[PDB]
Amino acid sequence: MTAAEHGLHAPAYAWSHNGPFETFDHASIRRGYQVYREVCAACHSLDRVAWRTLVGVSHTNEEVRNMAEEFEYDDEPDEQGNPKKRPGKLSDYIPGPYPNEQAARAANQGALPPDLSLIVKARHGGCDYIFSLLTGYPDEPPAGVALPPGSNYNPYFPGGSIAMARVLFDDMVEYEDGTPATTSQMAKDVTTFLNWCAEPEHDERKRLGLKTVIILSSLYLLSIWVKKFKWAGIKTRKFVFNPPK
Amino acid sequence: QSFTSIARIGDYILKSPVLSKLCVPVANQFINLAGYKKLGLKFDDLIAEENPIMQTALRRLPEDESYARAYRIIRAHQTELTHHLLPRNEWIKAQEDVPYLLPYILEAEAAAKEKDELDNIEVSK
Amino acid sequence: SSLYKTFFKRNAVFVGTIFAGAFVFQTVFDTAITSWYENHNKGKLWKDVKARIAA
Amino acid sequence: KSTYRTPNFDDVLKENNDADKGRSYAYFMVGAMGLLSSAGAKSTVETFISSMTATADVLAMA
Amino acid sequence: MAFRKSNVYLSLVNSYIIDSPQPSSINYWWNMGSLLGLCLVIQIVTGIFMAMHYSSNIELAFSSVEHIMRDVHNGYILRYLHANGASFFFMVMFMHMAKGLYYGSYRSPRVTLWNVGVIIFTLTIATAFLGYCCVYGQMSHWGATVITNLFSAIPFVGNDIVSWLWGGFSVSNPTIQRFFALHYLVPFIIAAMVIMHLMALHIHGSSNPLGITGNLDRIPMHSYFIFKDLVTVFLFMLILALFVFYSPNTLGHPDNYIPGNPLVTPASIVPEWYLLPFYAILRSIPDKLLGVITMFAAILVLLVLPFTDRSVVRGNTFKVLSKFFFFIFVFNFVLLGQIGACHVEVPYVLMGQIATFIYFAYFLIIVPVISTIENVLFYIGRVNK
Amino acid sequence: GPPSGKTYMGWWGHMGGPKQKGITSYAVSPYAQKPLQGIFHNAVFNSFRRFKSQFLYVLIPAGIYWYWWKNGNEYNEFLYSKAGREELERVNV
Numbered sequence A: 001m002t003a004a005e006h007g008l009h010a011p012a013y014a015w016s017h018n019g020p021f022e023t024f025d026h027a028s029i030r031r032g033y034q035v036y037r038e039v040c041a042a043c044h045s046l047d048r049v050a051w052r053t054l055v056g057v058s059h060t061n062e063e064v065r066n067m068a069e070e071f072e073y074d075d076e077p078d079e080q081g082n083p084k085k086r087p088g089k090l091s092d093y094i095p096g097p098y099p100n101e102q103a104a105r106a107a108n109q110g111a112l113p114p115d116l117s118l119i120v121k122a123r124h125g126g127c128d129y130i131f132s133l134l135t136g137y138p139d140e141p142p143a144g145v146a147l148p149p150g151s152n153y154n155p156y157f158p159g160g161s162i163a164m165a166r167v168l169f170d171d172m173v174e175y176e177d178g179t180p181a182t183t184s185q186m187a188k189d190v191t192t193f194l195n196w197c198a199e200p201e202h203d204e205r206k207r208l209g210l211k212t213v214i215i216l217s218s219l220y221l222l223s224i225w226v227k228k229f230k231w232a233g234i235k236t237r238k239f240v241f242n243p244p245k
Numbered sequence B: 001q002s003f004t005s006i007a008r009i010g011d012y013i014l015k016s017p018v019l020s021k022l023c024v025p026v027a028n029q030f031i032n033l034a035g036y037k038k039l040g041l042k043f044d045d046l047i048a049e050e051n052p053i054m055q056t057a058l059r060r061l062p063e064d065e066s067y068a069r070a071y072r073i074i075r076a077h078q079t080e081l082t083h084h085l086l087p088r089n090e091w092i093k094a095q096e097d098v099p100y101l102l103p104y105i106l107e108a109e110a111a112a113k114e115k116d117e118l119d120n121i122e123v124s125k
Numbered sequence C: 001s002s003l004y005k006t007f008f009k010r011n012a013v014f015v016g017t018i019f020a021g022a023f024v025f026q027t028v029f030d031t032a033i034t035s036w037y038e039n040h041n042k043g044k045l046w047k048d049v050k051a052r053i054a055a
Numbered sequence D: 001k002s003t004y005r006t007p008n009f010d011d012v013l014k015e016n017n018d019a020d021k022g023r024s025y026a027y028f029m030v031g032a033m034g035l036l037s038s039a040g041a042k043s044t045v046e047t048f049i050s051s052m053t054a055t056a057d058v059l060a061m062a
Numbered sequence E: 001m002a003f004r005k006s007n008v009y010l011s012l013v014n015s016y017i018i019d020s021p022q023p024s025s026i027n028y029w030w031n032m033g034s035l036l037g038l039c040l041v042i043q044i045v046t047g048i049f050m051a052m053h054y055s056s057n058i059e060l061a062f063s064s065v066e067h068i069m070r071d072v073h074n075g076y077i078l079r080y081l082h083a084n085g086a087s088f089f090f091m092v093m094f095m096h097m098a099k100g101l102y103y104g105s106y107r108s109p110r111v112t113l114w115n116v117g118v119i120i121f122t123l124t125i126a127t128a129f130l131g132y133c134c135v136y137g138q139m140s141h142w143g144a145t146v147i148t149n150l151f152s153a154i155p156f157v158g159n160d161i162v163s164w165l166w167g168g169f170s171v172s173n174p175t176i177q178r179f180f181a182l183h184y185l186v187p188f189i190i191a192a193m194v195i196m197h198l199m200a201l202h203i204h205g206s207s208n209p210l211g212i213t214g215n216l217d218r219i220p221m222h223s224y225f226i227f228k229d230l231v232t233v234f235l236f237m238l239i240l241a242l243f244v245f246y247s248p249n250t251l252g253h254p255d256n257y258i259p260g261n262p263l264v265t266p267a268s269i270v271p272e273w274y275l276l277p278f279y280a281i282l283r284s285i286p287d288k289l290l291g292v293i294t295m296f297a298a299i300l301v302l303l304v305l306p307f308t309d310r311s312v313v314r315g316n317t318f319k320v321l322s323k324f325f326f327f328i329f330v331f332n333f334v335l336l337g338q339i340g341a342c343h344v345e346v347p348y349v350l351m352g353q354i355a356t357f358i359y360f361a362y363f364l365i366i367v368p369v370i371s372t373i374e375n376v377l378f379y380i381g382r383v384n385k
Numbered sequence F: 001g002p003p004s005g006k007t008y009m010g011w012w013g014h015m016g017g018p019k020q021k022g023i024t025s026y027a028v029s030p031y032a033q034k035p036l037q038g039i040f041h042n043a044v045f046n047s048f049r050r051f052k053s054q055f056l057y058v059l060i061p062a063g064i065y066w067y068w069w070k071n072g073n074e075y076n077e078f079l080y081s082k083a084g085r086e087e088l089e090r091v092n093v
């Protein structure tokens, strides 16, 4: 199939979480959340992530509580049955920008910004893809490419024509920890944050794997030895034939 | 495939000097590559025995050949399980790789075929 | 290995001792692994990030 | 050949200066396999049993 | 006599696992069967614990699986074990089948054993498909759509069978709820078929790598093979563990992390890897009916081998031409799989059609021709007259 | 119990094999044997033999298929590049 239709292969960046013994970098997760809140959240929902999961990961119990309370959620009807709102709690899920699909399409030239809860696992390339997409918008499309009105060119997206315009620009965010908010830095951070949203069990999963693999390896090496011992009499057994008179 | 049939085709090739000089050398090379002789086996020891013809045949085999087949088979399993081959001096030589069970098999197939023929004979008046 | 004959003296290890040793192993092994893991990832953990935060 | 003439096992037999040499090694291996298995089985059982405890999303402090 | 022999229940255990006489020479290729029983157990246990947290309603299925992944303690371990285990179940089954093919295990007196195995294989393929649909991701919806549609190729009543399977106008709630119910049931029917498989195995015992009788030298299952089985059980668990903990999604499809959408079929749709060779076979026939008939025939043709293998010796160990063509068959099968993973494009379409021919030609032409030639070669190479 | 059909395998004491006579076997307790460490120096060069006889049966069919695969792939790549769009229109429909 043509290269344009397939999309440009995303290269392999040196993510700090790549490697069997590597955990996520939690400071990057912390920063990624800010980029998500200040840039992405205007068009992208994050439906599967509950506030409580942030605690002990990227924020404190107090910080998350404040963040949740900035949003109103439907509450149980009062004594008389009329509906009533309520500030958010830790048990709630991060709210999305649109009330329904139709309202989301209207605000984006008819396109639908997907939920990002699983985006890292729902695309070949994973982090490499997401990062590359965000930092891969050329100022001008290659010569000859007739880009439809309202569309944008990005070599990493299949078909090259994507409905999301470039949204990351240098210093559009003021990192709370003082880090220089370059576009590639912000891309690196949200992407790390989105990987955690999709794989919250990552750090713990690899820790368990380490114990599991050590025990199983030992059991394997050990069983070989035990088997050879139990078979030694059979393996070294010897026969002699003396034809009967 | 019956041994009567393998014999029919094989003998036809063996008689005709055209085919006989063309095939046998190929067949000889095939037999050496097979490798069964390195385990101490004779080809006839390799015939699948779980059928009535082969049971009739093995039953009719003289004692001495029977005890011999038994030793060769046991020796082959033991060598196979040790992942080795026998020392070269113990391999079966071509002169020894004789079709010792073949005559008993052919005889039983003929007896069997005749019964099948006689049980189904039509009659004309 | 005479180290074996001191503890078990030519006899195999009995299930009771095996079970008991397993409970011990479970705890020891877990701490050893968690320690190495957290150390290998020093700087990236939330523990480390919280130290550089004050609010 | 005479059945009383036992074939050569020299290549397999250990020069017995330490009688319980193979026994100690075998029993240590068997014992260690028994230990790591029991710990493994215990961990497997707890993993499954704990999947039935209250889920993270239902521990709401009303 | 010993209690293990006298007790009604224990004697079954004794005759099948303790005193069962095994041919002394079976190699590690004979360890696959126990690995298959182990796989069956892993799938059943992990599936029941997950069922406890799963909702089959089409509106909740995908989220209920995300709930298992996020909120259930050790939930991701159960799901990843189940998903990766299904793949491992197929890898081992192919090896178990390939072993049978190579050693003439399908031959008399083990024909019944082989036939039951073919049934288990069909049931296992159906069970995995039903499970895959339960996730209700994009691949789930379209997989359910495409596969239930296979039956529309049946003349006259085909579309009726499909609407009946669906429970409506298209793959919807009724469909996913019945597929979960059926996914839970089939594993138990497979278990009953495995017992029938072991029953046929017991009357004649296992075969061996030499292809000849094992009656002159047997050793008890207990101790020898129990511990030899243990060696591969751990190696199997180690490798499964590497995937479950270190690379849990490498054997799946990213599109199944997207909720099913009835109005859009992804351009990236690709069947599960273990179904690729069959998919390729179907795709190679440019006709609807014939495509589905040929694909099903690719499975049923396995039943023909006891009749087309004309050899007078069981197995390929001492057969030069048969060994060569066996490997042509294996690699041809891998090719069929690589073609299934490719686009319906020029070089690929023709290669798939030729590989499909080679697949069927192996059972119907190559084996009978080659086995006959080998029969004759064995004869003229020793008869001096 | 109920009559059982004749098979090709019996049980200990009546396995169904032919009568054995003249064969004498010998064995030595695994306990009396040199603990697992001798599988080297004596059992190393001897190994790798059950693949030196087999690799050709595996390699040749593998080679044929890998080459065939590489070729068709590289041809597909050419067909979908600029240089091959002419040939593409020809071989396509």
Ligand code: HEC
Pocket: A035, A036, A039, A040, A041, A042, A043, A044, A108, A111, A112, A113, A114, A119, A123, A130, A133, A134, A157, A161, A162, A163, A164, A165, A167, A168, A190
């Ligand atoms: C609204 C103006 C947007 C903002 C702010 C961001 N995104 Fe977006 N995104 C938007 C649309 C309209 C689309 C649809 C694209 C299409 O052609 O259908 C998207 C899509 C994405 C995707 C998915 C791409 C794919 O492979 O299908 C990703 C990974 C994505 N967006 C990421 C992303 C991030 C991380 C953002 C903040 C840094 C961000 N988006 C902002 C619209 C808008």
Ligand code: HEC
Pocket: E039, E040, E043, E044, E046, E047, E048, E050, E051, E054, E065, E079, E082, E083, E086, E089, E124, E127, E128, E129, E130, E131, E132, E133, E134, E135, E183, E184, E187, E252
């Ligand atoms: C209820 C008991 C139950 C049994 C018994 C069971 N499963 Fe499942 N299986 C499930 C549930 C629940 C799901 C959905 C969760 C999931 O996706 O893993 C599932 C999903 C699947 C999936 C999809 C995996 C994925 O990608 O998420 C496959 C494939 C599968 N099962 C294969 C099997 C096989 C093969 C067997 C039997 C040999 C089996 N299952 C037995 C309950 C069961």
Ligand code: HEC
Pocket: E029, E030, E031, E032, E033, E034, E036, E037, E040, E093, E096, E097, E100, E103, E104, E105, E106, E110, E113, E114, E116, E117, E118, E120, E121, E194, E197, E201, E205, E206, E207, E208
């Ligand atoms: C289509 C073929 C086929 C399938 C599928 C199959 N089997 Fe078998 N099985 C056989 C044959 C044939 C043998 C006899 C092999 C021999 O002795 O040479 C066998 C033997 C066995 C053995 C004995 C040990 C061994 O590996 O030879 C066990 C145990 C076994 N199978 C279990 C299973 C289980 C469990 C499943 C599936 C869940 C399964 N089989 C599926 C064909 C099959």
Ligand SMILES: COc1c(O)c(C)c(C/C=C(\C)CC/C=C(\C)CC/C=C(/C)CC/C=C(\C)CC/C=C(\C)CCC=C(C)C)c(O)c1OC
Pocket: E016, E017, E020, E022, E030, E031, E033, E034, E037, E038, E040, E041, E044, E045, E048, E191, E194, E195, E198, E201, E202, E205, E206, E225, E229
């Ligand atoms: C002649 O050759 C042989 C041979 O004969 C045999 C037997 C073996 C050995 C292998 C086997 C016997 C394999 C057998 C496997 C099976 C019979 C599989 C049966 C499968 C099942 C899944 C059983 C059903 C189980 C359950 C319902 C339990 C799950 C549920 C639970 C734990 C409930 C949980 C709930 C709560 C509330 C705690 C060989 O290896 C062999 O060749 C060397």
Ligand SMILES: C/C=C(C)/C=C/C=C/[C@H](OC)[C@@H](C)[C@@H](OC)[C@@H](C)CCc1oc2c(O)c(OC)cc(OC)c2c(=O)c1C
Pocket: E122, E125, E126, E129, E139, E140, E142, E143, E146, E147, E148, E165, E182, E269, E270, E271, E272, E275, E278, E279, E282, E295, E296, E299
């Ligand atoms: C209620 C129970 C029912 C209805 C059971 C039905 C069982 C059917 C068969 O099993 C016996 C069937 C699964 C088996 O055919 C022999 C497989 C090889 C089918 C292979 C198969 O997979 C696909 C797939 O997985 C997809 O996913 C995204 C998409 C697909 O197209 C794009 C296919 C496809 O085109 C084919 C042929």
